[PDB]
């Protein structure tokens, strides 16, 4: 509710030149009243008259109806930033010491220097890649300061800190002015030409951090990073974080030389400009009390919000007898028992998987009588099959003749790594084998990433120690020979076994299409990179193989991407490092009570997670939309809050206000309301109370809820014609002809949409759908009242059960200690009372008998299993090649719809003995209600249920008719 009113301040703040609220309602009489109020408001404003009398004349509308959005009639230029910023440009601009970056262009020079001419310029090295503007951030920041310019006591101190810092940003930006952003939210050459190239990204990071400060320490930290980052753009993040690995070993629940290693980390930080942050760690080392460890964590998390190290592709590419090691035997075990049908029909499975396949070059295509630039690997199969070009038995050579294009992955505080771009023959020849490999991993604890439904908590608990950072080793030219030799050595079935082998052989000698300016060079490449199916799976096999080789009783051994550990000091560490050295491999072999790795660090016997997800600077420009960009931003914010870092929620609200609004005219924007924004739908961006999900309980919410589903999926005048060409029909039929026998169409209908659901990706479709959606969306807010609802959802089901639950105050004592100290108090309180789980809740039906039987190579989603299970015994399909399971399919479907596995709920033990407070759906509804109350009150409530026997049958029918709501942004799933 505070969001809707806050938005008013923001609009009044930006505009000084009318605001015409818009109210809707399920009530029919009120609705006409809403229309009268609305109509009169325009007239009054377009006539320069008051509106105070009208509001009094519509108290019923304000008090009893729902706000749908707030129109804004403006007539300035949105250049209020230039004017507002000056008040804060009092400080002295920063001057970047262009003598800090080993790589010239990494230095914050003047754009006109790095790129003398326009045809030479490329924001490819600093692009925020986010669909929001720098001016907006500046505007948003100014709004908060105006609002909190009079706060008192401690609140004021936050302002003084925020005020100070922001000045650094305002002062520097002011010197060069505030850069103007184009429709594509990019930053052209003319605007950039006379300004410090790395200005825009820097401002975003500085703004993101300064709007994340609260305590004094946050300020010094935001302040030191903000300043050094302006000139240092290649080691600040690495330097600030680096010592965290040694620190974990320090606290109870170390050899002299280890201490020196830490001193050097501190010195390097010091010799690099740092002052206060190094001092803080120094103070911490006097007692090394886990009680004061939270600070060390804020530093490691904060170092990430400095931005993304985006260097030139070639530079990134450039960094790249005793090999017992090439154990990599592991391959055989994973594929020993399996004439598995999967291995025999590997070609169909890989073909089907394409939806979850990597990416290839944006080839040229023709379907029917047109041309397109699709980059999706699946479509390539369509063009090739309908062109006699499709030839999987012949996997394209990846060498000098036909080199490998290149993709990339950027991450704060680490040298850029490259990603191959192999054709589709490679994915197809790798899906079945990898998939079979994973099943073995799935039940092998050594692979801490795959094992069962295991969550990071299980991994944490396992650690009766020695940890490593084999990230560089996975790309060490030395590694490729062994790695490939082992996979090949281990290697319908023979056809598949052989083809996979060839992928390795073509790779053994792989050339890279590495760009080098507006030109595409072409150098060699004797290192291994990612881009193959087997990448993540095979990489682990190698990493596990490596530690076994290196390893004066092995209690546990584990792998996890770029880290491998084992619980079995100065002598052992030396012996370990020298051993790693002998194999000529760059690695961080440490030894300790604690361990640190890329995904989680265990300092003090407590589990910690890094919290540095850049919010105002994205890694790459995907295909998401401005709206989805916001829902994604809010997702990111929640994950951070949960992990540690916390950007002020008011700021986030401001961004959502900027990011969601849409203009119908050149002087009229339409800011969607809080009800429109948070109501559970395909456009839901956030929650009206972090960590708590609501569901239509009032008539209005449901009235609007059914109304929104309507314009949820709007056809694409491209995604249909594509299925109209012989290509699509041949591809679908061709795939099916080797998958079906009887009348499969239930299966057949799904496959088509399986493609029609990703096809939008193609710009002309995503853009066509996105632009068209605006016309429908704008009109949608206008006038509805005409919908033939009949479909039911969780909202409708839950609304039914509510009245039958009797709530009464109950009490729950805190008994479980803390192990994830960063969790916000309200979240931490639930774990303290009911505990937490170290497992994921089956939300796909994968663990049902019918599914196991179907596992034919086909794989029906939870939705399909749900629809199929709801069928008559006669109809129940097993057309594929092959029970009262009916309960389990529904359970997985329901849990999926409640995101019980994502968000903060994934950290709650929903089967906690303590969560007695309740007296399948009635129960889960009972549990969610109690948990949510706990989060929003700190106290517990006990629920009683006297659901009549008659009501249960009506409800039972509803259960098998629930539809979904797509929005993927909501994605909070972090561990």
């Amino acid at each position: 509710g505070k969001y809707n009113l806050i938005l008013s301040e923001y609009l009044s703040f930006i505009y000084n030149s009318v605001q015409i609220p818009i109210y809707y309602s399920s009530n029919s009489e009120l609705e006409n009243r809403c229309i009268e109020f609305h109509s009169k408001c325009l007239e009054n404003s377009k006539n320069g008259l008051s509106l105070r009398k009208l509001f009094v004349e519509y108290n019923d509308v304000i008090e009893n109806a729902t706000l749908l959005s707030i129109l804004s009639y403006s007539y300035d230029k949105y250049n209020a930033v230039e004017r507002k910023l000056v008040k804060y440009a009092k400080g002295k601009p920063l001057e970047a010491d262009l003598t800090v970056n080993e790589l010239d262009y990494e230095n914050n020079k003047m754009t006109s220097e790095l790129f003398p001419t326009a045809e030479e310029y490329t924001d490819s090295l600093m692009d925020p890649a986010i669909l929001t503007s720098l001016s907006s951030n500046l505007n948003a920041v100014m709004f908060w300061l105006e609002k909190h310019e009079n706060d008192v006591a401690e609140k004021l101190k936050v302002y003084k800190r925020r005020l100070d810092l922001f000045t650094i940003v305002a002062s520097t930006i002011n010197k060069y002015g505030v850069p103007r952003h184009n429709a594509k939210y990019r930053y052209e050459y003319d605007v950039m030409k006379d300004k410090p190239y790395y200005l825009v990204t820097w401002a975003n990071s500085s703004i993101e951090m300064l709007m994340s400060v609260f305590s004094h320490d946050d300020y010094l930290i935001a302040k030191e990073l903000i300043v050094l980052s302006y000139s240092n753009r290649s080691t600040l993040a690495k330097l600030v974080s680096s010592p965290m690995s040694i620190l974990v070993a320090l606290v109870d629940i170390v050899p002299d030389q280890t201490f020196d290693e830490l001193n050097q980390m501190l010195d390097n930080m010091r010799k690099a400009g740092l002052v206060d942050i190094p001092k803080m760690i120094q103070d911490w080392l006097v007692d090394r009390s886990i009680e004061k460890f939270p600070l060390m964590a804020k530093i490691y998390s904060w170092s990430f919000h400095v931005g993304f190290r985006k260097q030139k592709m070639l530079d990134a590419a450039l960094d790249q007898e005793m090999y017992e090691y090439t154990l990599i035997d592991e391959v055989v075990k994973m594929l020993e028992e399996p004439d598995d049908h999967l291995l025999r029909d590997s070609e169909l499975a890989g073909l089907l998987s394409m939806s979850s396949a990597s990416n290839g070059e944006s080839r040229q295509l023709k379907f029917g009588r047109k041309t397109i630039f699709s980059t999706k690997k699946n479509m390539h199969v369509m063009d090739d099959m309908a062109n006699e070009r499709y030839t999987p038995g012949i996997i394209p050579p990846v060498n000098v003749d036909k080199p490998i294009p290149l993709g990339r992955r950027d991450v704060p505080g680490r040298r850029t790594r490259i990603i191959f771009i192999l054709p589709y023959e490679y994915f197809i020849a790798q899906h079945a084998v990898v998939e079979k490999m994973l099943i073995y991993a799935k039940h092998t604890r050594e692979y801490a990433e795959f094992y069962s439904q295991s969550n990071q908590l299980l991994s944490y608990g396992d650690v009766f120690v020695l940890y490593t950072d084999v990230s560089q080793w996975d790309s060490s030219q030395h590694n490729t020979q062994p790695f490939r030799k082992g996979i090949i050595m281990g290697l319908k079935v023979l056809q598949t076994l052989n083809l996979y082998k060839q992928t390795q052989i073509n790779l053994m000698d792989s050339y890279v299409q590495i760009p080098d300016g507006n030109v595409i060079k072409k150098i060699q490449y004797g290192a291994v990179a990612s881009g193959e199916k087997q990448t993540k799976a095979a990489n682990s096999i190698a990493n596990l193989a490596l530690i076994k080789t290196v390893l004066h009783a092995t209690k546990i051994i584990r792998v996890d991407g770029d880290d491998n550990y084992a619980v079995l000091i100065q002598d052992v560490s030396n012996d370990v490092r020298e051993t790693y050295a002998r194999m000529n491999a760059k690695v961080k072999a440490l030894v300790s009570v604690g361990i640190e790795i890329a995904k989680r660090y265990i300092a003090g016997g407590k589990i910690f997670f890094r919290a540095g997800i850049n919010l105002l600077n994205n890694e790459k420009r995907g295909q998401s939309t401005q709206w989805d960009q916001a829902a994604i931003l809010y997702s990111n914010y929640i994950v951070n809050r949960l992990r540690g870092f916390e950007t002020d929620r008011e700021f986030i609200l401001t961004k959502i206000m900027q990011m969601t609004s849409v203009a119908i005219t050149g002087s009229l924007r339409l800011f969607p309301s809080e009800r429109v924004l948070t109501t559970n739908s395909t456009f839901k961006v956030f929650d009206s109370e972090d960590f708590i999900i609501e569901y239509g309980t009032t008539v209005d919410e449901v009235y609007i809820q059914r109304a929104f589903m309507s314009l949820s999926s709007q056809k694409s005048g491209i995604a249909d014609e594509i299925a109209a060409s012989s290509t699509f029909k041949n591809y679908v039929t061709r795939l099916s002809e080797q998958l079906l026998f009887s009348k499969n169409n239930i299966v057949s209908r799904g496959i088509a949409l399986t493609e029609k659901a990703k096809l939008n990706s193609y710009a002309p479709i995503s853009l066509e759908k996105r632009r068209a959606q605006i016309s429908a969306l704008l009109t949608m807010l206008q006038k509805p009242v005409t919908f033939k609802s009949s479909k039911i959802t969780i909202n409708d089901i839950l609304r039914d059960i509510k009245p039958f639950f009797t709530v009464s105050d109950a009490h729950l004592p805190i008994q479980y200690q803390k192990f994830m100290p960063t969790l916000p108090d309200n979240v931490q309180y639930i774990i303290q009372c009911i505990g937490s789980r170290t497992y994921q809740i089956e939300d796909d039906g994968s663990k049902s008998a019918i599914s196991r039987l179907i596992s034919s190579v086909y794989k029906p989603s939870i939705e399909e299993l749900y629809k199929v299970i709801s069928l008559h015994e006669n109809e129940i399909y097993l057309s594929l090649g092959i029970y009262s399971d009916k309960y389990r399919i529904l359970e997985s479907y329901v849990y999926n719809l409640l995101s019980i596995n994502y968000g903060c709920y994934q950290l709650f033990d929903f089967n906690s003995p303590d969560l007695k407070l309740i007296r399948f759906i009635l129960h889960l509804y009972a549990k969610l209600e109690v948990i949510n109350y706990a989060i929003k009150n700190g106290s517990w409530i006990s629920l009683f249920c006297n659901y009549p026997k008659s009501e249960m049958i009506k409800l039972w029918k509803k259960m098998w008719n629930i539809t979904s709501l797509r929005s993927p942004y909501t994605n909070a799933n972090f561990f």
């Binding site: 196991r852 039987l853 097993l878 029970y883 009262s884 309960y887």
Partner: protein
């Protein structure tokens, strides 16, 4: 067809499970052929196999008795006949033959199936035991050349 009459003959329901875990066993348009082949070769090559079951899949056990009656047992590993039999003896034959009292306590070494022989009395039951237990292979020489 079969698996459907299967659900019938037993009478199933709603969160009232009993025999429901006996049909992640259908898939035979693959299983029977494998089980068949597999069995022979085993004999011929005279290879020794293992055993992957559940303890809640009673049916799967019944059929075991089919198997066991057949292959002279010595054809399976030790750690496997052990499991199997005791699993039968403890959750299949006592628990509905008012013979429980002692769900059968065991400690490895000796023959946990065997011992069931000199155990309870009943003739039909009793012949099975001797025939299966002391059932072995007949070591035969010449066959129209060594």
């Amino acid at each position: 067809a079969q698996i459907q009459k299967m659900s019938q003959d037993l009478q199933l329901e709603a969160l009232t499970i009993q025999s429901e875990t006996q049909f992640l066993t259908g898939i035979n348009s693959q299983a029977a052929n494998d089980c068949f082949k597999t069995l022979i070769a085993a004999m011929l090559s005279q290879r020794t196999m293992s055993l992957d079951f559940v303890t809640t899949n009673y049916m799967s056990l019944i059929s075991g008795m089919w198997l066991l009656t057949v292959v002279p047992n010595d054809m399976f590993i030790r750690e496997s006949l052990v499991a199997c039999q005791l699993a039968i003896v403890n959750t299949i034959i006592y628990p509905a033959f008012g013979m429980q009292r002692m769900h059968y306590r065991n400690g490895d070494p000796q023959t946990p199936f065997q011992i069931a022989e000199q155990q309870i009395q009943n003739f039909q039951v009793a012949n099975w035991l001797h025939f299966v237990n002391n059932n072995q292979f007949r070591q035969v020489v010449i066959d129209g050349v060594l």
